[PDB]
């Protein structure tokens, strides 16, 4: 394996080693897909938690939550069931990344906390939650995709999804009691936050992940007054 941590095959073995040793976790990931770094993975893990709020023995429930576009690492499910015995409903539209997520949840034995589900590309939220009448979700959790020379085009996408994400949590109101996304630069923000503001959620709230070089915010909201 190459020492240079610029070569995804030593991104890969230290994400895959690292999960071993910390958490007992094995996965297989291809390099075809976003390799994950943990550090970051797990900030937005602890965020989640601070918005769901801490729980009284006596009041101990299971937690339950949706990843969107839950990667072949399933990385975000994998650790907040492993860490904090959360359930997911995890969603893909990507085969590959489906397979190999439904493969990683078996082989870490968490069928039980994790459904994996492919969903169709036009859906979101609402496709995955329809006609749910029995439970309200915790949260939602996002770390969006990137939709000639200038494909930075594709960086600029995740305002156009996560607007998308706003959209049905619109209609979904409090069937979820927060919902997030991860943001990938700082300037997505500003018009996120006016987009919230205009439509009147109610709630609205940010924060910064930083993993050394790398930056990122995650804005997340509620219909909870
Ligand atoms: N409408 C949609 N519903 C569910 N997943 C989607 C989606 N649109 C794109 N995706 C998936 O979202 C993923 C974003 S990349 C994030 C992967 C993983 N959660 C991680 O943090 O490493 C991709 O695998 C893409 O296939």
Same mark, same amino acid.
């Given at each position: 394996?190459?020492?240079?941590?610029?070569?995804?095959?030593?991104?890969?073995?230290?994400?895959?080693?690292?999960?071993?040793?910390? +958490?007992?976790?094995?996965?297989?990931?291809?390099?075809?897909?976003?390799?994950?770094?943990?550090?970051?993975?797990?900030?937005?893990?602890?965020?989640?938690?601070?918005?769901?709020?801490?729980?009284?023995?006596?009041?101990?429930? /299971?937690?339950?939550?949706?990843?969107?576009?839950?990667?072949?690492?399933?990385?975000?499910?994998?650790?907040?069931? $492993?860490?904090?015995?959360?359930?997911?409903?995890?969603?893909?539209?990507?085969?590959?990344?489906?397979?190999?997520?439904?493969?990683?949840?078996?082989? !870490? !034995?968490?069928?039980?906390?994790?459904?994996?589900?492919?969903?169709?590309?036009? $859906?979101?939220?609402?496709?995955? /939650?329809?006609?749910?009448?029995?439970?309200?979700?915790?949260?939602?959790?996002? !770390?969006?995709?990137?939709?000639?020379?200038?494909?930075?085009?594709?960086?600029?996408?995740? /305002?156009? +999804?996560?607007?998308?994400?706003?959209?049905?949590?619109?209609? /979904?109101?409090?069937?979820?009691?927060?919902?997030?996304?991860?943001?990938?630069?700082?300037?997505?923000?500003?018009?996120?936050?006016?987009?919230?503001?205009?439509?009147?959620?109610?709630?609205?709230?940010?924060?910064?992940?930083?993993?050394?070089?790398?930056?990122?915010?995650?804005?997340?909201?509620?219909?909870?007054?």
């Amino acid at each position: 394996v190459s020492l240079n941590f610029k070569d995804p095959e030593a991104v890969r073995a230290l994400t895959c080693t690292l999960l071993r040793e910390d +958490f007992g976790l094995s996965i297989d990931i291809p390099l075809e897909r976003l390799i994950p770094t943990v550090p970051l993975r797990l900030n937005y893990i602890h965020w989640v938690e601070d918005l769901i709020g801490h729980q009284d023995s006596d009041k101990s429930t /299971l937690r339950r939550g949706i990843d969107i576009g839950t990667g072949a690492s399933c990385i975000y499910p994998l650790l907040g069931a $492993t860490l904090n015995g959360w359930y997911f409903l995890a969603t893909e539209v990507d085969d590959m990344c489906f397979n190999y997520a439904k493969k990683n949840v078996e082989q !870490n !034995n968490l069928s039980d906390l994790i459904k994996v589900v492919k969903v169709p590309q036009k $859906t979101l939220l609402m496709d995955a /939650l329809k006609e749910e009448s029995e439970i309200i979700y915790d949260f939602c959790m996002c !770390n969006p995709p990137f939709f000639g020379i200038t494909e930075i085009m594709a960086e600029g996408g995740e /305002l156009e +999804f996560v607007k998308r994400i706003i959209h049905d949590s619109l209609q /979904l109101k409090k069937r979820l009691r927060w919902y997030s996304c991860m943001l990938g630069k700082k300037c997505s923000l500003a018009p996120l936050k006016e987009e919230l503001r205009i439509q009147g959620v109610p709630k609205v709230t940010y924060t910064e992940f930083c993993q050394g070089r790398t930056m990122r915010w995650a804005l997340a909201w509620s219909f909870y007054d």
